[PDB]
Design a protein around this ligand. Structure first.
Ligand SMILES: O=c1[nH]c(NC[C@H](O)[C@H](O)[C@H](O)CO)c([N+](=O)[O-])c(=O)[nH]1
Ligand SMILES: O=c1[nH]c(NC[C@H](O)[C@H](O)[C@H](O)CO)c([N+](=O)[O-])c(=O)[nH]1
Ligand SMILES: O=c1[nH]c(NC[C@H](O)[C@H](O)[C@H](O)CO)c([N+](=O)[O-])c(=O)[nH]1
Ligand SMILES: O=c1[nH]c(NC[C@H](O)[C@H](O)[C@H](O)CO)c([N+](=O)[O-])c(=O)[nH]1
Ligand SMILES: O=c1[nH]c(NC[C@H](O)[C@H](O)[C@H](O)CO)c([N+](=O)[O-])c(=O)[nH]1
Ligand SMILES: O=c1[nH]c(NC[C@H](O)[C@H](O)[C@H](O)CO)c([N+](=O)[O-])c(=O)[nH]1
Lengths: 200, 205, 200
């Protein structure tokens, strides 16, 4: 589990093909001495488990993860190539506060940025989400876009807007986002359960 | 408390029947110096208390647990024989990373594997959950199956699917699971809070 | 921080009025050499700081704490008189085992015991929760009642059930608890998250 508070901008070093999957090497500012093997890291909102770390003595700062069929089909990982900057977040530690938005790294699909407009030192992004996600939006709660916890402001069916503040643009990949870009979308976990309960 | 991140594959050494209970001796890779009597260890998702350990200074690596009436009835434990491989997880300590979700080790019942499909080096498992548990299983939600924190992908009535990654298949008992097998199911406690608010709001109006 | 695993039954020796507060002197079985000035101790679920200790060379086994407006308003502290037995728990350190659940020692309010019923070695307590907390008390959920980590056995409107085992009744103030008694209530992190989302 995560909080959607991005702590690093990672970089895709290499993409290696696996049997119906990809091996991703991600460059990070995180100390590999603080990353245990098997740790869960949210990579642009995708929960992935660390499978390899640099050799003892090596000055390299990377971690390796494996993205399989569900992650490839639904997430932006399908388009990831060497040089791609990605949002990073470490798992929530027992004792730390949960905050206003829990993020599990279970992305529903890809939302598309249709408009980017500057509003002072902040940037308003207008997005379109897959049709099936529309009833979860309009509820105007919090959403995880590329692993970033964001408040849903205006809504028109499957179209919605988010306001990215100066700090968020600086410390996340949102500073380089533009119209046409695909982002990972994760609907609020409690809202998922509430909607599933409503079916019965 | 647990997170559903399996850290060892234990092996059932001894199965001893007691008065409405069973004494289980589990061989483990865990350091005996890290385990004290009264410790809680999730055994294939079942929270069990350590009742016996090897002698002070011994190199033997095992721990004993007792599964009573509730555990024997709701869980897969009733079928556990000597040689059975089980998923193991230590209780969360202050400051430990919660890699999965909040897992309590309180198994709600048993889910049956209806299909095992290869997805390259990953494996898709289709499961049938008890009817009562179905409203708590949501698409892209969390579930603890044999104590393993997993993302629920598709859901159709009381049937749902999960994708077991290569890493999980290698470090858990999921690598040997097949169609027809019964697994321990613990629905996400977060779903109970959604059900509670909906129950309170219904009683209100 | 705390886990809800009570380690001592303290006794209130003195209740002294302060300017906009209350000073409490608590007798404890804790080793006096292990209690340092400024240490956090959960007193019937209320996180309070040690303000005074016995002087150099004294054999006395007490500690002093100060309760302010928030604690006096929300907790049972306002009703505490000399001779009152209270649950005690020392603060956790990074890496400590957590036998109960995550307890911050920040009580949300007071729950009232409406019924006490024997069930073999165990005792079933029925409690009335404040209306603001009631929609966030769910079955199988963890709750801190008088600082004791307990599982919610059943729910019904504003009422909920907890089952107190023989050991818990023996080592905590729950053994002397009766119908009509007010207890401190602290909802867990999941309940707090659900309450925060409903508030938003
Ligand atoms: O393919 C993977 N999926 C994993 N999880 C599920 C994944 O997050 C979802 O399939 C994705 O978010 C799309 O829903 C992984 N871990 O959890 O560690 C992992 O390492 N690899
Ligand atoms: O720019 C924003 N940051 C927000 N949150 C903080 C953001 O998640 C972090 O700054 C970022 O993840 C980097 O840590 C928002 N909400 O939480 O709703 C929001 O609407 N906009
Ligand atoms: O039978 C037992 N049940 C226990 N707990 C409840 C058990 O987890 C559930 O009965 C089971 O998960 C089914 O719901 C134990 N501990 O908690 O330690 C234990 O040692 N033995
Ligand atoms: O195989 C998977 N592992 C996952 N997580 C990690 C898994 O719990 C551990 O690898 C395992 O418990 C061993 O530590 C998943 N998600 O978290 O979503 C998932 O969907 N599939
Ligand atoms: O009145 C006090 N409140 C304190 N904390 C907050 C207190 O726990 C809450 O007000 C109470 O639990 C009600 O929410 C103290 N410390 O933390 O040390 C203290 O010493 N005194
Ligand atoms: O009597 C109980 N003790 C429980 N836990 C142990 C209790 O917190 C301690 O015995 C006590 O705090 C003294 O250390 C319970 N749960 O944890 O759920 C419970 O429901 N009932």
């Amino acid at each position: 589990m995560f909080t959607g508070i991005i702590t690093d901008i990672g970089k895709v070093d290499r993409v290696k093909p696996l049997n119906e999957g990809v091996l991703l090497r991600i460059e990070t500012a995180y100390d590999p001495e603080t990353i245990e093997l098997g740790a869960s890291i949210a990579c642009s909102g995708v929960c992935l488990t660390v499978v390899a770390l640099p050799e003892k003595g090596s000055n390299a700062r990377w971690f390796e993860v494996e993205a399989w069929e569900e992650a490839l089909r639904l997430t932006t990982i399908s388009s990831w190539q060497s040089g791609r900057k990605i949002n990073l977040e470490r798992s929530l530690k027992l004792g730390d506060e949960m905050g206003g938005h829990l993020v599990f790294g279970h992305v529903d699909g890809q939302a598309e940025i249709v408009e980017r407009k500057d509003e002072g030192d902040a940037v308003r992004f207008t997005l379109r989400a897959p049709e099936e996600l529309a009833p979860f939006i309009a509820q105007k709660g919090s959403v995880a876009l590329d692993g970033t916890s964001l408040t849903v402001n205006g809504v028109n069916a499957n179209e919605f807007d988010v306001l990215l503040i100066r700090h968020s643009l600086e410390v996340t990949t949102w500073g380089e986002r533009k119209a046409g870009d695909k982002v990972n979308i994760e609907i609020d976990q409690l809202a998922r359960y509430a909607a599933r309960l409503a079916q019965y």
